Design an enzyme around this catalytic site. Structure first.
Site, PDB file in Angstrom:
ATOM      1  N   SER A  41       1.033  -1.359   0.052  1.00 37.10           N
ATOM      2  CA  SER A  41      -0.101   0.085   0.481  1.00 37.10           C
ATOM      3  C   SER A  41       0.673   1.476  -0.597  1.00 37.10           C
ATOM      4  CB  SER A  41      -1.112   0.465   1.323  1.00 37.10           C
ATOM      5  OG  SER A  41      -1.806  -1.213   0.781  1.00 37.10           O
ATOM      6  N   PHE A 101     -11.185   8.467  15.527  1.00 34.25           N
ATOM      7  CA  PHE A 101     -12.153   8.091  16.026  1.00 34.25           C
ATOM      8  C   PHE A 101     -11.683   6.545  17.017  1.00 34.25           C
ATOM      9  CE2 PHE A 101     -15.202  11.328  14.705  1.00 34.25           C
ATOM     10  CZ  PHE A 101     -14.102  11.927  13.699  1.00 34.25           C
ATOM     11  N   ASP A 150      -5.804   0.213  -4.326  1.00 34.25           N
ATOM     12  CA  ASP A 150      -3.659   0.030  -4.501  1.00 34.25           C
ATOM     13  C   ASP A 150      -3.712  -1.175  -4.814  1.00 34.25           C
ATOM     14  OD1 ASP A 150      -4.930  -1.073  -2.306  1.00 34.25           O
ATOM     15  OD2 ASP A 150      -2.763  -0.272  -0.863  1.00 34.25           O
TER      16      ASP A 150
HETATM   17  C1  LIG Z   1       4.924 -11.134   6.398  1.00 36.34           C
HETATM   18  P1  LIG Z   1       5.878 -10.672   6.332  1.00 36.34           P
HETATM   19  O1  LIG Z   1       6.620  -9.837   7.706  1.00 36.34           O
HETATM   20  O2  LIG Z   1       7.314 -11.556   6.527  1.00 36.34           O
HETATM   21  O3  LIG Z   1       6.052  -9.487   5.407  1.00 36.34           O
HETATM   22  C2  LIG Z   1       5.491  -8.215   4.500  1.00 36.34           C
HETATM   23  C3  LIG Z   1       5.371  -7.160   5.962  1.00 36.34           C
HETATM   24  C4  LIG Z   1       4.312  -6.656   4.756  1.00 36.34           C
HETATM   25  C5  LIG Z   1       3.633  -6.346   3.784  1.00 36.34           C
HETATM   26  N1  LIG Z   1       2.618  -5.644   2.827  1.00 36.34           N
HETATM   27  O4  LIG Z   1       1.875  -5.862   1.972  1.00 36.34           O
HETATM   28  O5  LIG Z   1       3.428  -3.906   2.760  1.00 36.34           O
HETATM   29  C6  LIG Z   1       4.058  -8.185   3.118  1.00 36.34           C
HETATM   30  C7  LIG Z   1       4.959  -9.071   3.238  1.00 36.34           C
HETATM   31  O1  LIG Z   2      -1.925  -1.108   3.990  1.00 31.67           O
HETATM   32  P1  LIG Z   2      -1.648  -2.011   1.924  1.00 31.67           P
HETATM   33  O2  LIG Z   2      -0.259  -2.846   2.247  1.00 31.67           O
HETATM   34  O3  LIG Z   2      -2.573  -3.340   1.832  1.00 31.67           O
HETATM   35 CA   LIG Z   3     -14.390   5.428  18.113  1.00 31.42          CA
HETATM   36 MG   LIG Z   4      -4.630   1.803   3.255  1.00 30.32          MG
HETATM   37 ZN   LIG Z   5      -3.120  -2.181  -0.593  1.00 34.96          ZN
HETATM   38 ZN   LIG Z   6      -2.979  -5.323   2.490  1.00 32.25          ZN
END
Ligand SMILES: CP(=O)(O)Oc1ccc([N+](=O)[O-])cc1
Ligand SMILES: O=[P-]([O-])[O-]
Ligand SMILES: [Ca+2]
Ligand SMILES: [Mg+2]
Ligand SMILES: [Zn+2]
Ligand SMILES: [Zn+2]
Ligand SMILES: *[C@@H]1O[C@H](CO)[C@@H](O)[C@H](O)[C@H]1NC(C)=O
Ligand SMILES: *[C@@H]1O[C@H](CO)[C@@H](O)[C@H](O)[C@H]1NC(C)=O
Ligand SMILES: *[C@@H]1O[C@H](CO)[C@@H](O)[C@H](O)[C@H]1NC(C)=O
Ligand SMILES: *[C@@H]1O[C@H](CO)[C@@H](O)[C@H](O)[C@H]1NC(C)=O
Ligand SMILES: CP(=O)(O)Oc1ccc([N+](=O)[O-])cc1
Ligand SMILES: CP(=O)(O)Oc1ccc([N+](=O)[O-])cc1
Ligand SMILES: CP(=O)(O)Oc1ccc([N+](=O)[O-])cc1
Ligand SMILES: O=[P-]([O-])[O-]
Ligand SMILES: [Ca+2]
Ligand SMILES: [Mg+2]
Ligand SMILES: [Zn+2]
Ligand SMILES: [Zn+2]
Lengths: 481, 481
Positions: free
Chosen positions: B92, B269, B357
């Site tokens: 994200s 919130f 995203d």
């Molecule tokens: C599971 P692990 O902590 O190893 O790795 C990730 C950490 C964040 C992420 N992300 O979508 O920002 C994807 C994999």
């Molecule tokens: O917070 P995002 O990596 O879906």
């Molecule tokens: Ca609340």
């Molecule tokens: Mg988000």
């Molecule tokens: Zn995302």
């Molecule tokens: Zn995610």
């Protein structure tokens, strides 16, 4: 791998400025389409397109996701809602009715409104819906059907057939009651319903009587003729048409496609479906791209224009096997056929749509590094401390337990053309999926392909663009030169 | 169930003719956007949209797939390529850089070019890329950030922050070395980087010093302030702004949104992310839709216009849990917020984009009947003679073996809001997916949203439409009335 050029924001800003410039130059045509082409990637949903893009990008000398497919270059995109009238996750027959006839139908019927019922011959009549290909022929255009499946398979059959049962390939498949009631097998409908100038794909066996040796596999009886009514549908088809030619191999196809005397061409290159491109014998069999060029050679002769159906029909089959390697290599060849047709026709007078009939429960996940193989392992182990692949299926025949546990997987294993990606639920065949698919469009009136549309829109926009069908009183000028 | 009206081809032909008519009436604006809104469905890929559509359709009195979402009504659709510079399946943070700053980045960074490196503070400087929200503020527009996650979460942070580590919510998260090097936590950046007129969502705890009781959960210490630097960032923010107000519950939000003296509003919130809509206390907490209306009340006062970011931020979280019920109900509320914003603004002067995203390894398969619940069982048993669901994941925490085998599933089970759909591969969290996502657009210059584009296009088209950013010398007339 991080490509160094992409570390500079200028790279992205320049690309986007170019994209905005291109977007601003788009203008709608005031002119009709002379020609119509629908490229149908059977099962080619959004996850398939992206995965195929990455694979093709790497097949070149590139990292993958940044390289456009030929279909990615089409200016207009819509999302297509694929549900059949009776099922949320559709089949190829009733989607074909939608994108080729402009009317939604019931699962496993073809070319019929949803008043008909699957496998009930006596609900057929009155419910036939005429394809835009049929209407194009009626308007004097030449018409062609090209696919890697049997030409009697559900998708191509949508251009010409009307049947309550997509499984009725030859008379051998049709129950006695339905035969008495006059529901013709699809092979018969292929030669009888309408004049088709070019027919290229698989499905030899359904055209010949039982006992007829297949010319290519004369020593394999299972590949021989299937018909019980004594008919030779190829000879019947040839007999109705001066300048008609039948071919069953690539060399004869080539000869026919350059022969000015031909006018009608039927090329049936396997008993059933054509081989996967990775298994194709390039001496005996034409690729999808080669078949579409052959079709274009003949169809383009008509000064009134043509309608052409081109199907990447075994994309679907690869996914059903949960062999993404097969699904994605079929998709690349499909994209190659699109590219080739773009070279042989003009977007000034040809409306080309690329779409899928429906998707598959195919996903592309893990967090693989830029440039890594689409058939590789996700970085990092699963919760069971074994590896897993970036490509997975929701369901299908890749579900395995070896000694009561999910098996580990290696890169050598995961990259094999026979490898079945794992799924959550064991099924003999992986299932279609119900999410929207893309429609890509270029050419006259392609700008009308927009937003989120019912799958039927595909047929209607094509009829409209060429002023066919319920649309003369299209308020369009004659096709541009 | 087969709806009887759909058995008549006239039904489909009439719908398509209407669709063609609507398509033909579309015309590009020659005028700029006064206002800009980006609606970001975190994780809301194509399979999510279709599944949510069916659920929402049935939530009304309908069969499902035939009923448009509010987002489905947007005239212009493109496909967005979401890869990060360094990973095919993105996060994200770096997608936020793309769709909010117009530049692609590396996984888990925010608001930085791909010259920066994750968790390396000393690669930050020089690599900051300014968001179109920042540029809108610079041009005198009011700006708002609205989300169901922490306002310091990766997506909203893309509108204002620049960080090599999305995990740096407060100073407590930032390693000593990075603190010494001046990499500010995201909560600090929220109040310090730029003036933001409206900030609504979760993330109270990161604004207050350790020991500070949460006002809503004063008896749960884990919900209290996290900060180690003694700062009250809320008081600091209020102190910089005459007419600023801080609220932490729905009743105070309502009061503030109608108060002509307010001008700047921060509404936090929950301590962390807001509750799922299905768990929301409607006395204490505003829905996403309510928060976007509150934002619009204030932002619309500025005669120069506004930029608004609205995030369905917990769609993503539902999928990570492999609880499709949560993912899809979050998606519906997101669509409700889109609909509401459409009622409170004009497409004559407001460019609205809806996008995601990235996606998830979420699939919609089996061959369910028309009208059946999206949370139901596929018809027919799997190869192991047990039932399976139409919704599945490629990977994630729904993978189960009970007594060495895949468990059977009942309808009562599969329809529960806590049910985790099965996957192929056990992971604590289901994974994002890398396939293209949709961009939907309406308003001035929305017609430029077309084809297949890099995700960065979203930021660029928004800047262009409002003549911001590298685009005055947009050749556009002033916004229409
Ligand atoms: C599971 P692990 O902590 O190893 O790795 C990730 C950490 C964040 C992420 N992300 O979508 O920002 C994807 C994999
Ligand atoms: O917070 P995002 O990596 O879906
Ligand atoms: Ca609340
Ligand atoms: Mg988000
Ligand atoms: Zn995302
Ligand atoms: Zn995610
Ligand atoms: C089709 O035939 C079946 C079998 O005899 C019969 O039950 C049914 O009523 C018939 N339907 C129609 C439309 O005649
Ligand atoms: C192709 O077909 C023709 C018959 O039409 C045949 O003469 C020729 O041998 C075939 N080619 C091959 C390689 O079998
Ligand atoms: C960042 O700091 C680390 C740790 O001291 C060092 O190894 C690296 O060279 C630094 N990088 C830059 C860009 O200075
Ligand atoms: C909302 O917040 C205000 C303080 O700003 C407080 O007075 C009021 O009690 C709160 N409402 C609830 C229900 O806690
Ligand atoms: C496995 P079984 O034979 O039961 O069912 C199906 C038959 C055909 C089909 N189709 O996509 O046309 C889907 C399911
Ligand atoms: C793959 P390539 O395009 O190079 O070759 C062929 C092109 C067309 C053809 N035909 O019979 O129309 C046969 C082969
Ligand atoms: C859900 P519904 O729109 O009905 O009610 C609200 C709308 C706006 C609002 N505000 O504080 O801006 C609070 C509640
Ligand atoms: O149902 P189809 O993919 O042949
Ligand atoms: Ca052959
Ligand atoms: Mg097909
Ligand atoms: Zn299909
Ligand atoms: Zn299929």
């Amino acid at each position: 791998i991080i490509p160094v050029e992409e570390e500079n924001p200028d790279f992205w800003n320049r690309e986007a400025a170019e994209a905005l410039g291109a977007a601003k130059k788009l203008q709608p045509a005031q002119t009709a389409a002379k020609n119509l082409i629908i490229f149908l990637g059977d099962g080619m949903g959004v996850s398939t397109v992206t995965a195929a893009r990455i694979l093709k990008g790497q097949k070149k000398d590139k990292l993958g996701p940044e390289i456009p497919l030929a279909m990615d270059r089409f200016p207009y995109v819509a999302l297509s809602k694929t549900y059949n009238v009776d099922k949320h996750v559709p089949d190829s027959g009733a989607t074909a009715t939608a994108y080729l006839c402009g009317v939604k139908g019931n699962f496993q019927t073809i070319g019929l409104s949803a008043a008909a019922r699957f496998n009930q011959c006596n609900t057929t009549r009155g419910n036939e819906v005429i394809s835009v290909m049929n209407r194009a022929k009626k308007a004097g255009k030449s018409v062609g059907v090209v696919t890697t499946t049997r030409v009697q398979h559900a998708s191509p059959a949508g251009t010409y057939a009307h049947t309550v049962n997509r499984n009725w390939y030859s008379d051998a498949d049709v129950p006695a009651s339905a035969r008495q009631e006059g529901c013709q097998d699809i092979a018969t409908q292929l030669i009888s319903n309408m004049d088709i100038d070019v027919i290229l794909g698989g499905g030899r066996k359904y055209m010949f009587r039982m006992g007829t040796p297949d010319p290519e596999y004369p020593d394999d009886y299972s590949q021989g003729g299937t018909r019980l009514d004594g008919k030779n549908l190829v000879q019947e088809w040839l007999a109705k048409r001066q300048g008609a030619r039948y071919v069953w191999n690539r060399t004869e196809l080539m000869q026919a496609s350059l022969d000015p005397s031909v006018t009608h061409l039927m090329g049936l290159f396997e008993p059933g479906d054509m081989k996967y491109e990775i298994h194709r014998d390039s001496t005996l069999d034409p690729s999808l791209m080669e078949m579409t060029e052959a079709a274009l050679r003949l169809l383009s002769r008509n000064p009134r224009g043509f309608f052409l159906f081109v199907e990447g029909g075994r994309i679907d089959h690869g996914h059903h096997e949960s062999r993404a390697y097969r699904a994605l290599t079929e998709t690349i060849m499909f994209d190659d056929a699109i590219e080739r047709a773009g070279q042989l026709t003009s977007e000034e007078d040809t409306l080309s749509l690329v779409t899928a009939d429906h998707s598959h429960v195919f996903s592309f996940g893990g967090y693989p590094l830029r440039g890594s193989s689409i058939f590789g392992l996700a970085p990092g182990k699963a919760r069971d401390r074994k590896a897993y692949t970036v490509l997975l299926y929701g369901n299908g025949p890749g579900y395995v337990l070896k000694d009561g546990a999910r098996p580990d997987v290696t890169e050598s294993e995961s990259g094999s053309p026979e490898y079945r990606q794992q799924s959550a639920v064991p099924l003999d065949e992986e299932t279609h999926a119900g999410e929207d698919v893309a429609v890509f469009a270029r050419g006259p009136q392609a700008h009308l392909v927009h937003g989120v549309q019912e799958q039927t829109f595909i047929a209607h926009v094509m009829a409209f663009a060429a002023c066919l069908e319920p649309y003369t009183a299209c308020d369009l000028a004659p096709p541009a030169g």
